[model samples]
Target: CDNFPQMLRDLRDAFSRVKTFFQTKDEVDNLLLKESLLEDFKGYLGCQALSEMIQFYLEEVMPQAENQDPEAKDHVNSLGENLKTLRLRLRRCHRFLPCENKSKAVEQIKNAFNKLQEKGIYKAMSEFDIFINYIEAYMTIK
Candidate 1:
């Protein structure tokens, strides 16, 4: 928990650079991370949600995310770095805190994401700022 504050700060800094760029490109009417789906990330299962989300971003989203802007490209790399830091901390926390039995939720998210086919990658990328804000608020809660 002690380490999380700085980790979240790093994520915010990196994400801020490219968020609007990604959001504007999401011209599609559809959205993968719906309000109800994100609301599930509260309470006991929140950690599990974070774990799966971080994995999805770093492993699936970041690798395929593309932008022609050189500066945005550089910021994406930094975002990936902060994501890894968050993942590491979550991995350690899972040992004691233990996020269990929430695979179904994230699987639904991924399935909906993939169903978008070719547009999925970029759309998913656009939602990072939303997730970062969600996670930040979640962390600050008592």
Candidate 2:
């Protein structure tokens, strides 16, 4: 809807997808991956729940993931890329244009991202750089 800015809508779409994928305990088990990928979002968007999902996906899930899934590395890139788009949209939201959307699918993520107000922007150097790219891309009109 035009009620929210395009950038905001874009962010919600991408953010919501990642958030939903992470909710499946049987699917994305890596807590570090969840935390790392969602760090920017949780910090910026205000997410708080999924504390266990965060840890479950990281400590218990990821290590086991490498063996069961050979494409573990590839998935990492995808998740990172999705995050790039969300923050990319957020970056473009300079005018404070209105934005909004949610469901348990959305709420889980909206809830997941919004509450991380005081955390670090932790991530691998590569992922960290993309966030910088987002900042850089924000300044320039896409």
Candidate 3:
């Protein structure tokens, strides 16, 4: 649960490293690709971290809220909106980089997040919770 913040921080650090690498080099080559893109800027790591964070929030924090509490619903809804915004920002980063098909992939994730947000926090959180639990259970069983 607490590791979620560290995951975000790690993701931010990865982005910063990629940005710095790009600032110095005009073109991405095999070496730069291996060093920066593949080694440092791991997209899967960031996405996985984000998924875990959302899952934890939904599974652990959300259920504690009273069903009739409007404030709780509002707060969770706001969180969903904010997450969508963050996802969009991540898409922009992919768009900015003139690289592989990562931009489109990032856009797809952004779109999914947008759709989930539209479904309302409770539903979105529930779906995410299920996904997280499935993944965790699958991993443990394997």
Candidate 4:
């Protein structure tokens, strides 16, 4: 069985591997690597609804918004806001569900990250840095 801290370390290491992979300019390979990372995390933590939601937003919701449709942009923004709120609620729940599945949660995070990468949102930082920063901010808000 996995201990909590060890699980956390494994999560961080997985993210690190993702970050290193994205640091390269190879977008196709990066996407494949991201999917692989998601698969590994899913294997570690099992299925989680939040992971699916995040994946849907990244893969479906956000891409539909890039066409400059006002409704799409507004809807996506609203969903993003809702996701942040959900994360806050999750933080409160974390105390009670302390050992739930960090890897699963991290998978949701990677989905957000993959969307950012696909949309070219992280022009300044590498996709990995963007992902880590977003996760840190999301985790700290609660």
TM-score for every candidate vs. truth?
0.52, 0.26, 0.28, 0.28
Error of 1 at 111 (Å): 36
Q: Put down candidate 3 lDDT per residue, 18-126, tens digits, no spaces.
A: 3432344545554532444343345745554454555565566544542445445655445544554455555445432223125565587668777778665566576
lDDT of 1 by residue, 1-142 (tens): 5765665888888888868768756646877887755776765677667677777888787766744555577778888988787666765664523563346777988998889987888887999998899889989994
> By descending TM-score, how would the candidates be arranged?
1, 4, 3, 2
Best prediction by TM-score: 1
TM-score, structure 1 vs. true: 0.52
Question: Which residue runs of candidate 3 sit more than 4 Å off their true CA positions?
Answer: 1-44, 55-69, 95-142
Candidate 4 Cα deviation (angstroms), residue 131: 30
**Candidate 4 Cα misplacement greater than 4 A, ranges:** 1-47, 66-68, 95-142
Q: Clash pairs of candidate 1?
A: none
Model 3, CA-based lDDT: 0.52
- For candidate 1, the 10 contiguous residues with the lowest summed lDDT are 93-102
The C-alpha lDDT values of all candidates are 0.73, 0.47, 0.52, 0.52
RMSD of each: 17.7, 18.6, 19.2, 20.2
lDDT of 2 by residue, 19-48 (tens): 533444544445444666567545544332
